[PDB]
Symmetry: C3
Subunit: 446 residues, 3 copies
C-alpha cells in the first residue's frame, strides 16, 4: 500500500534505500541522486542504440579465394569494320551508300574521295546506275551477309588444350554489326569450367582482322572509323553485350594477355540497400541487369520517336530504313549514350558479376617465325605484322572474389544491448515496468 512497503518488495535496485523506514539523512539524498543519475544515464545509452538501429547499418565481407569448378564467362568480340569491301554489291551501294559516306545525296561518287588507283575503279563500276532498277533491301540481311565471316577470321582456337571450331561461336548482332560470342551458354550447350589459374586453363584465339577487306573511309559517320583491330567484352552468361560502350580493344600485330578475376557483388534489400529482383521483369530478357535495363531504354526510345528499331534491338518493331539510320536512328541513339541525363534510371540488382582484368602485350611475329606464318596461311610477310592477332583470356591464381553486404545490427542484438543497459544501471526488466504500472493502477483506484 505505502510507498515504503512497495519499494521494499520491488525489483528496482535503488528505490528501497530511498524509501526506507528511517528518518531523512545524508543517505537519502545520496541514494536518490545515484538512482536518478543511473536513470538518466540509461536514457543516453539506450537512445544511442535505438537510433543506431533505425539507420539500418551494414558492413561488408570481402572474401578473395582460389575457387575450383569456376564457370568460364562469355567472350564477345567485334571487328572494328562493319562491312567487308568485297561483299558490298550494286544494290547495297544504292540504298546504304550515303550512310557509309560512299555517295553524295544524288547517288554518285563524291569529288573528295580518298582511294588509290584500284579501289576507286572497283567503286566506279558498281556505282553505275544507268539502267539500274532497284530491288528491295533489308538492313538485317546486309549486316548478316556483308559482315566479317568467322570461318575466315578464326585461324586457330584452343580452350584448355582442346581445339575450338568456328561452330563454337554464336552470331550476335551489336552496333558494330555481325559479332561473335564464345561460350554463349545458349542452344543447349553446357557451360565450360576452369579449375586453376594460368594461361593453360584459358582461351587462346588467333584472328585475322583482314585490312584488305576494309571499305574506304571518306567521311566521319557512325559506321566507319579510323582504327583497326577488334573490341572484346568479357561478360557473364546471362548478360547481353554492350560492346560499343563497355568493350576493351585489342591491336593487330600483338599477343594480348588478359588476366581476369571474377568478382561477385551481393547487396541488401531495403531498408538496408537497394534490390530489384535479378530474375525479375525485363521486357525482353529473363535476368534483370544493368545492361538489360539500358537496351530496353534504347528500344523504347527509338520506337517512340521514329517508329523503328535498329538491327541490334529486340522486339517486333520494324527495322529502320537506311535513310532512317542517318536521319532518326543515329542522332537519337547518340543523344541517349552521350547527352541524356533524365530518360534512364536503373534500379540496382543484387547479383552483379564483375570481371576485373589486366592486359599485357608481346609482339607477333618475330623475325624468325615471320616466314613460317606467311607460308602456313598463304600470305605475305607484310600481311602478318599488320593483320594477325592473338588473344589470351585466362584467370589468375586468386580468381574468385565475393563482396557481400551483411547486416551489422539486428533486432536480436538490439534487445541484448538495451537489456544489458537496463540491467546495468537500475537492474530492471519489462516485468519491472509492469510492476510499476501495477502500483500506478492501484493508487488511482484508492
Amino acid at each position: 500500500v505505502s510507498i515504503q512497503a512497495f519499494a521494499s518488495s520491488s525489483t528496482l535496485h535503488g528505490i528501497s534505500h530511498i524509501f526506507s523506514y528511517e528518518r531523512l539523512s545524508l543517505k537519502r539524498v545520496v541514494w536518490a541522486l545515484c538512482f536518478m543519475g543511473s536513470l538518466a544515464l540509461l536514457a543516453l545509452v539506450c537512445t544511442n542504440r535505438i537510433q543506431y538501429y533505425f539507420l539500418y547499418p551494414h558492413v561488408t565481407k570481402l572474401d578473395e579465394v582460389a575457387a575450383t569448378r569456376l564457370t568460364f564467362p562469355a567472350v564477345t568480340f567485334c571487328n572494328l569494320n562493319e562491312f567487308r569491301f568485297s561483299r558490298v554489291t550494286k544494290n547495297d551501294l544504292y540504298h546504304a551508300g550515303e550512310l557509309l559516306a560512299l555517295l553524295n545525296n544524288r547517288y554518285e561518287i563524291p569529288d573528295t574521295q580518298t582511294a588509290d588507283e584500284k579501289q576507286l575503279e572497283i567503286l566506279q563500276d558498281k556505282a553505275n546506275f544507268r539502267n539500274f532498277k532497284p530491288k528491295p533491301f533489308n538492313m538485317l540481311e546486309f549486316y548478316d551477309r556483308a559482315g566479317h565471316d568467322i570461318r575466315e577470321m578464326l585461324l586457330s582456337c584452343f580452350f584448355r588444350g582442346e581445339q575450338c571450331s568456328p561452330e563454337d561461336f554464336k552470331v550476335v548482332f551489336t552496333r558494330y554489326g555481325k559479332c561473335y560470342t564464345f561460350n554463349a551458354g545458349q542452344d543447349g550447350k553446357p557451360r565450360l569450367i576452369t579449375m586453376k589459374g594460368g594461361t593453360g586453363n584459358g582461351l587462346e584465339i588467333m584472328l585475322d582482322i583482314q585490312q584488305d577487306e576494309y571499305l574506304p573511309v571518306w567521311g566521319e559517320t557512325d559506321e566507319t572509323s579510323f582504327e583497326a583491330g577488334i573490341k572484346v567484352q568479357i561478360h557473364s552468361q546471362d548478360e547481353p553485350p554492350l560492346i560499343d560502350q563497355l568493350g576493351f580493344g585489342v591491336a593487330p600485330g600483338f599477343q594480348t594477355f588478359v588476366s581476369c578475376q571474377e568478382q561477385r557483388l551481393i547487396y541488401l534489400p531495403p531498408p538496408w540497400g537497394d534490390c530489384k529482383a535479378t530474375t525479375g521483369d525485363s521486357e525482353f530478357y529473363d535476368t534483370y541487369s544493368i545492361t538489360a535495363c539500358r537496351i530496353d531504354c534504347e528500344t523504347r526510345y527509338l520506337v517512340e520517336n521514329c517508329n523503328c528499331r535498329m538491327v541490334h534491338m529486340p522486339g517486333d518493331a520494324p527495322y529502320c530504313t537506311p535513310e532512317q539510320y542517318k536521319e532518326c536512328a543515329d542522332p537519337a541513339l547518340d543523344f541517349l549514350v552521350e547527352k541524356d541525363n533524365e530518360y534512364c534510371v536503373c534500379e540496382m540488382p543484387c547479383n552483379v558479376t564483375r570481371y576485373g582484368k589486366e592486359l599485357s602485350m608481346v609482339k607477333i611475329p618475330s623475325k624468325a617465325s615471320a616466314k613460317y606464318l606467311a607460308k602456313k596461311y598463304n600470305k605475305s610477310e607484310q600481311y602478318i605484322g599488320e593483320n594477325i592477332l592473338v588473344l589470351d583470356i585466362f584467370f589468375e591464381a586468386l580468381n574468385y572474389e565475393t563482396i557481400e553486404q551483411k547486416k551489422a545490427y539486428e533486432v536480436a542484438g538490439l534487445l541484448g544491448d538495451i537489456g544489458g543497459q537496463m540491467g546495468l544501471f537500475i537492474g530492471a526488466s519489462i516485468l519491472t515496468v509492469l510492476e510499476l504500472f501495477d502500483y500506478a493502477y492501484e493508487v488511482i483506484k484508492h
Copy 2:
C-alpha cells in the same frame, strides 16, 4: 545488521543461499562454489570486452555502386618533349645549351653529335656567337614560349558529344614543362558531370605529338629522354599534378581506351586511425593531400640548399639559373624522389580519391583511313602512323566505390556487453555494488 539479514534483502542472486538461517550442510558448499565460480568467470569475460574496447577496433564498409551525377575528374597531359626545335633561338641556346646537352662547356657544338645533314646545319648557324652580346633570360618565359602549343597538338576534342576547344585546357607547369589540364575546375568554370558508363559519356582527344619538332638528343640529361608520346595523369580537381612520378604513358599510333572507376577512401581520426584535416594547412594549397605534402617538401628543400625554386614550384623564391638547374636543382630534386628516406613524412588525410584504370589499345590508322587523315590535316601517310594519337577516358558501369572505415565497438555497446555479463552470472548492477559498499560502511562504524 547481521550478514544473514543483509544477504536476504540484497540483490546478488547467490548470497542468500550461502548465508541462510540453517546449519552447515552440502548446500552451503555448493552454493558458494557456484557463486565464486560465477564471480570468477564474470571477470574473464569482462576483461575480454574492456581490453577489446581500448584497442579501438574498426571494420570497413565497401560499397561499389553505379552512381549518377558523378563529377568528371581533371586530366593533365604532358608531351614527352620539353621544348620545340623551331622555337629555340640563339639567345636560348646560349644560356640553356649546356643544360639541353647541345653545347660543350665552351659554348660550341660537341664533336660527338648525332644529327642528320639538315638539323646539324640549323644548329650550326644559331650557335654562332662571333658578335653575340647576350640578352637577359628567364626560364619561366622559356618553358612558356618554346614549349608545345595546344592549338597545334589538339586536332579534335569531344566531351559527351559536345566539341571541345583549345581554350578548355588550362596551362599548368610541371617538370616536363608546359602542360595542359582538361576540366581544371578553376577560373570560375563549373565542373563537368557524367551520368552513365561507356565511351559516349567520356572524353575523346586526338593529338599530334609532333616528332618533327623534337630537339635532338645528344646525351643523357634530365630534360631530354629517348621516348615519344605523352604522359597522362587522371587526378582530382583539388589536387595538383605529379605527372613526372605518377602519370601513365600513351603511345603514338594507337587509340588508348582508359576505363576508370572512382574510389573514395574515408578514414577515422585518432585513436582509431590517422587524420590530418583535409582542408587544413598546406603552405601553398587549400586542400591538404599527399601530393600537396610532397611539393612543399621539394619547394622547402631547394630554397634551403641552393636558394632558388624551379618553375613548377610555388612561392616567392627566385627562379633558378640554367646553371643552377645543372649544378643544384636537378641533383637535389633527384635526391628527394629517389634516395631520400628521412626528409618527408606525410600524415594521411581522410578524404583520398583514387581512380583505378584499365588501359587497352587498338591501332590507328587502318590502311583504309590512312589517306583520308593525310589529306584532312595536310600531312603524309608516314606522318600519321608516327604522330597521331587518340585517347579515350571514360567510366565503367560500376563507376563509383566507397571504402569507409567504421568503428566496430563503441561505448554504448561496451556497457551493453558488461551489463549483460554482470546480469548473467550474478545478476548485479551498479546499484548492487553501492549496496555492498553501504554494508561495508556500516560494519566499520560499528
Copy 3:
C-alpha cells in the same frame, strides 16, 4: 515450502504476482500471460544468437594506406626465346634437334623449312653427321649454356638512382629456360626497400631481346613460339616463379610503366576459414604457398609416370632425355596445366601477398634519339625499334593494402547478448535457474 512462499523470495520478476496470497482475479491471468509471453519471446531471440554463433561469422577489414619502409619484391623475367642460335652446336643439334623442330626423325633438315639464304646454310653444315660420333649430353647444361646471357641483354639498370650490375640478377630455371631474378633475396643479400611512390623509387631496366639470335621456327612445339619480347612476373621473395602461367608480357620497342600495389591477404583458421601453416611442410620449399603447392604436384606427377623430372623441377630424380621431353614430359605437363581436374588440390595459406598492377606504354625511340642509341650500343637504327625494351616497375602513392578477415561474433559477446536477453524479459541469471532446481530438488524429497 509452498509455491506462494517460494515465489515471493525468488528472483524471477513475474512469478511473485502469479502466486500471491490472494484470490483468483483478472490480474492472475494477465500476469501469467505476460510472464509466459516474455518467457517464450526470450527463447526466440536466444535461439537467434546461439545459431548465429555456431555459423562462425566473420567480417573484413580493408586498410589501404601509403606505407613506408616497404620491401621491394622480386622481379623475374624470361626472354621468349629459349636458346640462342649462335650457341647451338653440332652435338646439340644431334640430340635436341627433333625437339626444336629443326630435324626429321632421321636426323636431317626437313623439306618444309622456312629460312633465308644465310640461316639455312649455317644449319646445313652443322647438321652434317657423316663422320659424327656422338658425345654425351645433358639438358641442364644446354639451357645454361645456349640460353640468353644477361651480360648482353642488360644495357642499363637503375634502382632508386643507384646503378645495377649483371651480378645483381640471380639465374633461375623455368620452363622458358635460363631466366633471371632481380632482388631474389637469397645468397645473404639484404632486401631492398622503397619509401614513397613514383617512378624514381622503382626499377628501370633497358634490355635487348636479340632477335638476330632467335633460332628459326619450323613447326609448332612447346619450345618455339611465334612471338618476340619478354615475360615478367612480379612475385614475393619467398615464392618461386610460375612465369609460364602467371607472367605478363612486355613488347619490344616500347617503354612499359608498371604501377604496382602490394596487397596482403590474411585469413582465419578453422572453424572460421581455412589455414594451412604458411611456414608448414612443402616438400622442396620452406614457405608453403599456392605456387609451391603446384610445383611439387608437377614434380611428383612426372616422376611417377615417366621416371624423370624436367630441369626446372627440384628433387633428386634424373633429368629427362631430349626424347623423353617429346614423348613423356611435354604431354604429361600439358595435361596437368590444361586438362587435369582431379590431381591437385591446394589448401589455402593465410598469408597471401598479391601485387595488383597497371601497365602503360610509350614508344621508344623517337626520331630524334634513334641515331644516338644506334651509336651508343654499336647498332643500326632498324635494330633499335625492333629490339630495345625499357621496363619501369614502381609503386603508386597508396602502395600498401591489407585485407584481413576478423571474427564478427565471439564467446564473450555471446554471453553479453544472452545475458541481456535473459535480463530483459524475465530478469534471471544462471543463479536463478539453480534456485529453480533447488526447489525442484526439495519437492521430490518431500
